[PDB]
Paper text:
Phanta contains the substitutions Gln62Met, Thr69Val and His193Gln. The protomers in each protein are typical of the GFP-superfamily and consist of an 11-stranded β-barrel (or β-can) with two small helices forming interconnecting loops protecting the chromophore from bulk solvent.
Collectively, these data indicate that in Phanta the substitution His193Gln plays a key role in reducing ΦF, whilst the substitution Thr69Val is required to suppress formation of the protonated chromophore species observed in eCGP123H193Q. The Phanta chromophore has a pKa of 4 which is significantly lower than that for the other proteins (pKa, 6), and is a desirable property that minimises unwanted pH-driven fluctuations when it is used as a pcFRET acceptor. Omit maps show that the electron density corresponding to the imidazolinone moiety of the chromophore in each of the four protomers of Phanta is well defined. In contrast, there is evidence for disorder around the 4-hyroxybenzyl ring in protomers C and D of the Phanta structure, suggesting that it is mobile within the chromophore cavity. Since a rigid chromophore is considered a prerequisite for efficient fluorescence emission, it is possible the increased mobility observed contributes to the low fluorescence efficiency of Phanta (ΦF, 0.003). Accordingly, in the weakly fluorescent Phanta and eCGP123H193Q the planar network is significantly altered, leaving the chromophore without the underlying scaffold present in eCGP123T69V and eCGP123. In Phanta and eCGP123H193Q, Glu215 no longer interacts with the side chain of Gln193 that replaces the histidine at position 193. Instead a hydrogen bond is formed between the Nδ1 of Gln193 and the Oγ of Ser142, which in turn forms a hydrogen bond with Oη of the chromophore. In Phanta the hydrogen bond network around the chromophore extends from the Oη of the 4-hydroxyphenyl ring to the N2 of the imidazolinone ring, and the O2 of the imidazolinone ring via protein matrix hydrogen bonds involving the side chains of Tyr177, Arg91 and Glu144.
Residue numbers in the entry: 3 to 61, 65 to 220
Write the structure that this text describes.
């Protein structure tokens, strides 16, 4: 079902501190390699007045290099697909919630993403566009009350700079019942490869690999 080379088509509808926006994307990834690249275009919301970095993790855990001995909840979820619900709490009270419904047709993945952010201080590094990139991270994957959950302590590097923290909490729900995996970790690095002046056009990349804890 999951082809070694999978295309990506997405649509994100959002609002951050009241600013409404629509972003559309087209890309390709090698799901077994855990690599993917997206070309993102700002369709609505003129020049985005907030850091584009807060959006990047919202733009698919099917794109992870999974060891065989660890059940792959995300790749088994297809063709029907899966959904995810994420909470993103920033250290200065900025709060984001994003939802994504992921479907599949042929060699292509389709995402309907909803992104909502509020309480970002006007002088904070998000509204001030003072963020550089996300630091490489580790998502702790585990089953709590019969659902697959993912936690990640994220850190945005700043101009100067030091770090600006965010806590992610995600719920992964496959549409049809599949094998829930034992506790594992997913290491990732998300990067903006290129962009134009106002981030109207962005080229995004991600490399992700699953593994067990050496404990």
């Amino acid at each position: 079902v999951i082809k070694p080379e999978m295309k990506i088509k997405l649509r994100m509808e959002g609002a951050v501190n009241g600013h409404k926006f629509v972003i559309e994307g087209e890309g390709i990834g090698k799901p077994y390699e855990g690599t993917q690249t997206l070309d993102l275009t700002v369709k609505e919301g003129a020049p985005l007045p907030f850091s584009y970095d807060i959006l990047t993790p919202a733009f698919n855990r099917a794109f992870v290099k999974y060891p065989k001995d660890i059940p792959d909840y995300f790749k088994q979820a297809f063709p029907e697909g899966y959904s995810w619900e994420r909470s993103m709490t920033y250290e200065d009270q900025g709060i984001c919630i994003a939802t994504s419904d992921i479907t599949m047709e042929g060699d292509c993945f389709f995402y309907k993403i909803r992104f909502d952010g509020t309480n970002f201080p006007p002088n904070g590094p998000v509204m001030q566009k003072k963020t550089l990139k996300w630091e490489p991270s580790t998502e702790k994957m585990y089953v709590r009350d019969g659902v697959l959950k993912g936690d990640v302590n994220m850190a945005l590097l700043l101009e100067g700079g030091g770090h600006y923290r965010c806590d992610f909490k995600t719920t992964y729900k496959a549409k049809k019942d599949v094998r829930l995996p034992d506790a594992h970790e997913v290491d990732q690095r998300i990067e903006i490869l290129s962009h134009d002046k106002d981030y109207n056009k962005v080229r995004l990349y991600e490399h992700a690999e699953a593994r067990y804890s050496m404990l």
